[PDB]
Enzyme design. Sequence first.
Site, PDB file in Angstrom:
ATOM      1  N   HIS B 110       2.798  11.342  -1.603  1.00 27.27           N
ATOM      2  CA  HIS B 110       2.196  10.684  -0.454  1.00 27.27           C
ATOM      3  C   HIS B 110       0.857  11.370  -0.198  1.00 27.27           C
ATOM      4  CE1 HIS B 110       5.317   7.929   0.643  1.00 27.27           C
ATOM      5  NE2 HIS B 110       6.226   8.871   0.818  1.00 27.27           N
ATOM      6  N   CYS B 158      -2.178   7.825  -1.591  1.00 19.01           N
ATOM      7  CA  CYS B 158      -3.061   7.177  -0.625  1.00 19.01           C
ATOM      8  C   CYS B 158      -4.145   8.156  -0.203  1.00 19.01           C
ATOM      9  CB  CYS B 158      -2.293   6.701   0.611  1.00 19.01           C
ATOM     10  SG  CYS B 158      -1.231   5.279   0.330  1.00 19.01           S
TER      11      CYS B 158
END
Lengths: 170, 170, 88, 88
Positions: B110, B158
């Site tokens: 992440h 991301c």
Amino acid sequence: TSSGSEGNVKLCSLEEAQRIWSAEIYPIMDKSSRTRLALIICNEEFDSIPRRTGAEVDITGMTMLLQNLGYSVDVKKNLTASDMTTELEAFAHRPEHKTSDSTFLVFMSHGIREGICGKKHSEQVPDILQLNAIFNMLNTKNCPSLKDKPKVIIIQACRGDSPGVVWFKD
Amino acid sequence: TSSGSEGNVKLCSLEEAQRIWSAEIYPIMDKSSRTRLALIICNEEFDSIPRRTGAEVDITGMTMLLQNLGYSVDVKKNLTASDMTTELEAFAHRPEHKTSDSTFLVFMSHGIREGICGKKHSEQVPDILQLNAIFNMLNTKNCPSLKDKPKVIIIQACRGDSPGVVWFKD
Amino acid sequence: AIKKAHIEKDFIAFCSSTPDNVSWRHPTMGSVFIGRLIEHMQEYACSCDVEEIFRKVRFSFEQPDGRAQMPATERVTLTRCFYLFPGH
Amino acid sequence: AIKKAHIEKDFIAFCSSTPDNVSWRHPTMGSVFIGRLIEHMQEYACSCDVEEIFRKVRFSFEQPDGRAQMPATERVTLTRCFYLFPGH
């Protein structure tokens, strides 16, 4: 000959252009109609930071080079970060980009790790333009006229205080 | 055939290698003696962030690819930013780099704008590894064994919350 | 009808040095990176794309002296080769 | 005898998206960027240098769908072309 519009830039011949021309090349607009734009922002005189002597040589060199490459060059000098932002925003709004195939942006100033110094910069009161802001102002959202077109950003500045070297033995 | 050590990677023939071989190419060490290393750090299970389902597919794919390319692959899973730092530092100290010509580093987790999330990351208590730290740990100062050798960093994550798109009309 | 486009694409930035590090400017000759860039653009624009030209500029800085710097390309989203085709 | 070397050189980073923006991962098929990278490395490692392969990956993402992303190369100080020469 250097007397031409391309000056000291070596020409690409018709046979060499066809040897290059692949479906992985940016398209070039007709030379007769295209309106290429370039912007140079150069900070030489500062309030608190030493004078950038020799900056005029950089301005002359880059201006002539970009003109040689077919770009009409705007030159803006001694701007705060706020003024640079306003100038970038105005450049993004130029109608000539619609009939252009590319652009060059040149930034020349004192610099720190965080970014590029404006004319009023000091250690107590920072006046900095970040590279992130430059991209944002020129992206597809803020500059739709340059969608799908190469945007080349050139930055002359320090990015910190370090000499950038380490020692090694043979 | 895909039964070989290079698997599904298309081979470069001897004639195609000579066509490429210029003084602007990174040198390749002898296949018989070289000790190429690669590192994959993949965070799948987190304390506060949702499970990264499908990460095992990424691990399998990248591990096999790097092996196909001649790299011995270390795989490390579910690490804090502190653990990733310790692991990077250990990788930089590996004696095999001295007899290697290059390296690959793969990071999969992440992510936010600031960088890559560790296993303990939350909005209240951030656990982030910055890309800047990765470069620093692998540079000439901290990893002299990889001096003059290509260091390829791959990051799946991301970099913020935005969909990355804008609308336009025909 | 409306269609989606990437918000950020077709960019290339080229900085005079690496992060944390200084860039040099001669008082009469000008900035070293700027001068080096012009020379490489003049020589290689005819035959090389911008990414390749910038690589060549980087190579020319490889052997460090008393005033060293290593230019770096940043945040590159060029999806095609950008040839200047000088003269056309 | 001691000699100077650039502190940071011969790096290339390749990120799954542009700053501020999301990167996508299929629950069973894996990360889109990772899968796309493997396919391009398998196909083009034999004939193209790493910078060119990464450019090709970027091109493959050009037409945006409901789940869009544009990979970006960052902080590049490669001074030469890096060919993998697979099989050698």
